[PDB]
């Protein structure tokens, strides 16, 4: 029992990270067979960051402009090539350590493990939700550019994120790994602001059934509703709206508790209206929404990875 | 900016995990040159957990009643001995993956990276503190016994918890990798107790001077207090006393933003006295007091490791 923010084992990602610089510019990139992927700023200098123009700054660098290091051994760079917003360079070597992968675009309300970066090496790794303003409420500190978010799923690394930027909020942004960015934001340094978020509903039901799982029941009740009445209150209170599909997502969790799903969106209805009294729910003060239905399942009956 | 519960990597630990079993009964075990330790209790069948008598128990076995398996190969075991509640099985192959290590006992608010592992398979990673009562608030499922515990120094793991069970409270306790318990229990299957847990004070100091690194200002005010003043109402509110050498490990923290301690003691006091209002800190409802001074410094800084 117990229930924690768990990431996934960063063991098979660690060995994919290498240093990119170019000119004065380090950060880190992804090095998966004879390619390394890392954000395209890192060809800018300091007079080009508020408006670059990447096709004239790239057609200006040749293959020896790119230092990539993994560990001690250099990398020797044999070609490069933009993809949106990422750049591909082809290096020399394949890495021996390339896992079984894909590359997945992911949507708002997904959750994936980030394994932060510095000069190439591994500094931490944490679980976060894609907000449904297509931010990430990140911890990155100036150099983590390129560190990347994924998911396992058997043996299977799925890459879904790169870091390109911190916004003026605090919150982070950055592309899928073929380049495109995650909302409406771009890689220059202008000032841009993310649209207004939302609570993630489908994921604030599946952490009540982990509260239910684990013992701490005292916000159930008796009462039902239908989606269109729980639609109502909880648009006023800026949670997304609920659809059937993710009725049927919470399946598994309604049987295994033998709560209805409408029935625990009653329960959400009165903590919405009534707040939570200084009562706690799996020690937290506040409704928790960076769990998916599948988190709560792989947490609460304990599947692993090969 | 931002701040997380972030673990180490862990993928020099996922390298060390095998499975481990005697008879009927399967756990994890940490593979390490060529000795796999793992808990004692392994080799107990349903009729000895009760009260088992662990010498006559292991007297009864013989080498090839333990199977150790690495993902497919199979380690032939060569020997096996009990070092307090931890079993150590001599193989005849050294783990070519061991990294530089090395065994340390932790003391009570201090912080590690749990590795949860079924079948010798990881599972997640999620970071927790070591109570003052001396459980830990972990999450486990069957099968969970033999993970550990870890951080990471420079190059160095620093394995400091093997996990041996959960009490009916829904806590955990394990031991050392000597196989000393935190704590006063035994690795029966009575039914034991925790203490009476406490607040770890100087990790709330901590995390309220990350809040401020962060930008989160609005809980500080111009007063201060003395320790002694301090202290009073801390233990009015279960509140670990907090000593001069508490107040030295803070000191960069303190100096990079510029808030003494005592001053930020009076805050801590304020907000203990008058609760939050609901409002928030780094986004959490609660005082939150699983990060270290250490923590701390490394998240809001930077440092990463080989
Ligand atoms: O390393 C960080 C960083 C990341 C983070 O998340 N937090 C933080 O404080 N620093 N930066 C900030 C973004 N920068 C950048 C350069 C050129 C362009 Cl064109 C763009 Cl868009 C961005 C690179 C260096
Ligand atoms: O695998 C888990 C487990 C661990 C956990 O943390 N949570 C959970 O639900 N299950 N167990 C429970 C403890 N058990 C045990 C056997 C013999 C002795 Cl002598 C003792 Cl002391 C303990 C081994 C199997």
């Known amino acids: 029992s117990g229930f924690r923010k768990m990431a996934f084992p960063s063991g098979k990602v660690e060995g994919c990270m290498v240093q990119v610089t170019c000119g004065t510019t380090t950060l880190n990139g992804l090095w998966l067979d004879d390619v390394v992927y890392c954000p395209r700023h890192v060809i800018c200098t300091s007079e080009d960051m508020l408006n670059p123009n990447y096709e004239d700054l790239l057609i200006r660098k040749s293959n020896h402009n790119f230092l990539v290091q993994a560990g001690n051994v250099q990398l020797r760079v ?31 309300g997904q959750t994936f493990s980030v394994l932060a970066c510095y000069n190439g090496s591994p500094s931490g790794v944490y679980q976060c939700a894609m907000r449904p303003n297509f931010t990430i409420k990140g911890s990155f500190l100036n150099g983590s550019c390129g560190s990347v978010g994924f998911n ?3 043996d299977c690394v799925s890459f879904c994120y790169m870091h ?3 916004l003026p909020t605090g919150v982070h942004a950055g592309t899928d790994l073929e380049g495109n960015f995650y909302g409406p934001f771009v890689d220059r340094q202008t000032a841009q602001a993310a ?28 009462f039902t509703t239908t989606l269109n009445d729980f639609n109502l209150v909880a648009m006023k209170y800026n949670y997304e709206p609920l659809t059937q599909d993710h009725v049927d997502i919470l399946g598994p969790l309604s049987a295994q508790t033998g709560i209805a799903v409408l029935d625990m969106c009653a329960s959400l209805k009165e903590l919405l209206q009534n707040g939570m009294n200084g009562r706690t729910i799996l020690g937290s003060a506040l409704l928790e929404d960076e769990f998916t239905p599948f988190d709560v399942v792989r947490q609460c009956s304990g599947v692993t990875f090969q």
């Open 78 to 108: 044999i070609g490069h090539s933009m993809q949106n917003c990422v750049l591909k360079l082809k290096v020399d070597t394949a890495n021996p350590k390339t896992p079984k992968y894909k590359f997945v675009r992911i949507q708002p």
């Open 164 to 166: 390109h930027m911190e």
């Open 195 to 222: 649209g207004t978020d939302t609570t993630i509903t489908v994921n604030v039901l599946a952490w009540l059934y982990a509260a239910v799982i684990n013992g701490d029941r005292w916000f159930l009740n008796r």
């Open 152 to 154: 396992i799923d058997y």
